[PDB]
């Protein structure tokens, strides 16, 4: 058992947990959150779009590790890293690599509102009713203290008052004054 594990110097920010990604419901809720952190922390963030499944160390080892080492490059200049990962739907899905990303957990406080969200997306997402509520339940079955940042706020500004201030408390933790 090694006591120290080579992690990046600035942890990559990940947004997840509303429900299963790969849908019009969960992704378009997160796409509003990537827009807020783009211009609020402009010049001190690196926001990327993730394609290959990084829960593997499908894709081979080389195509994933060359993207993991790109996250290793984005920790060298001591700035924020943000990931648009499209298959991450579990806390322990990213527990075996050497990244340890920031688990921002979007919390839908009421499970009945999700399937009302589902019937607002037309009949395309109305064919995918109970399949989204599975990992919407399983992430709600996971303990909230295992996560990092919890967002239970319906309005934009109240989910974003936590989403800006927590990492601003995290930036001053990483960076000391002169």
């Amino acid at each position: 058992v090694p006591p120290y594990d080579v992690v990046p110097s600035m942890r990559p920010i990940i947004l997840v947990g509303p429900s299963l990604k790969g849908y019009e419901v969960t992704d378009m809720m997160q796409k509003a959150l990537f827009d807020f952190l783009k211009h609020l922390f402009d010049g001190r963030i690196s926001i990327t779009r993730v394609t290959a499944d990084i829960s593997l160390a499908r894709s081979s080892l080389a195509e994933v590790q060359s993207e993991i080492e790109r996250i290793f490059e984005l920790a060298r200049t001591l700035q924020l890293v943000a990931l648009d990962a499209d298959t991450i739907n579990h806390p322990a899905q990213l527990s075996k690599t050497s990244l340890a990303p920031i688990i921002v957990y979007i919390k839908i406080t009421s499970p009945k509102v999700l399937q009302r969200l589902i019937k607002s997306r037309g009949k395309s997402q109305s064919k995918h009713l109970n399949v989204q509520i599975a990992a919407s339940e399983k992430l709600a079955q996971c303990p909230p203290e295992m996560f990092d940042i919890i967002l239970d706020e319906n309005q934009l500004e109240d989910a974003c008052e936590h989403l800006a201030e927590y990492l601003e408390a995290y930036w001053k933790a990483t960076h000391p004054p002169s």
Binding site: D152, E153, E165, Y166
Partner: peptide, 14 residues
């Protein structure tokens, strides 16, 4: 909204 808003404060402050 008194038993909710300051419970959003009890999470952030710790």
């Amino acid at each position: 909204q008194k038993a909710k808003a300051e419970e959003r404060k009890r999470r952030k402050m710790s």
